[PDB]
Amino acid sequence: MDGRIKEVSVFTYHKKYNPDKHYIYVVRILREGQIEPSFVFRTFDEFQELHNKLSIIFPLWKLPGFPNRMRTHIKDVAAKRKIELNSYLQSLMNASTDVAECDLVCTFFHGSHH
């Protein structure tokens, strides 16, 4: 119930069996202009990079806490991040309008893969 983005969530995730590879999070976005949601695909490192960019331009008191990380607790980490990244996105969009609507946040939400 903000700008053009009205709802965001981490819809699901997939990938990586064994170690080497990585997980991708599906982010579901509902905008005031459309009836159906859009979906983009973002890694944990993309979310952490978005927070790191925001920290360049904003003091941390303006931003949500980021669920920082990346032989671990298996891939219960993927399931854990689905929840934490969703809480991050909700806090971000419920931030002051200067943060929730800034070009860095708008850019993160544009482009399936980019």
From Swiss-Prot:
Homology family: Belongs to the PI3/PI4-kinase family.
Resulting phenotype, residue 81 to A: Abolishes interaction with PtdIns(4,5)P2-containing membranes
Domain PX: 3-110
Tissue: Expressed in columnar and transitional epithelia, mononuclear cells, smooth muscle cells, and endothelial cells lining capillaries and small venules (at protein level). Ubiquitously expressed, with highest levels in heart, placenta and ovary, and lowest levels in the kidney. Detected at low levels in islets of Langerhans from type 2 diabetes mellitus individuals.
Gene (name only): PIK3C2A
Assembly: Part of a complex with ERBB2 and EGFR. Interacts with clathrin trimers. Interacts with SBF2/MTMR13.
Role of this protein: Generates phosphatidylinositol 3-phosphate (PtdIns3P) and phosphatidylinositol 3,4-bisphosphate (PtdIns(3,4)P2) that act as second messengers. Has a role in several intracellular trafficking events. Functions in insulin signaling and secretion. Required for translocation of the glucose transporter SLC2A4/GLUT4 to the plasma membrane and glucose uptake in response to insulin-mediated RHOQ activation.
Known disease link: Oculoskeletodental syndrome: An autosomal recessive syndrome characterized by congenital cataracts, short stature, dysmorphic features with coarse facies, dental anomalies, multiple skeletal abnormalities, and neurological manifestations. Other recurrent features include hearing loss, secondary glaucoma, and nephrocalcinosis.
Descriptive protein name: Phosphatidylinositol 4-phosphate 3-kinase C2 domain-containing subunit alpha
PTM text: Phosphorylated upon insulin stimulation; which may lead to enzyme activation.
Span of the entire protein shown here: 1421 to 1532 of 1686
Subcellular locations according to the entry: Cell membrane; Cytoplasmic vesicle, Clathrin-coated vesicle; Nucleus; Cytoplasm
Effect annotated for changing residue 69 to A: Reduces affinity for PtdIns(4,5)P2-containing membranes 7-fold
Disulfide bond entries: none
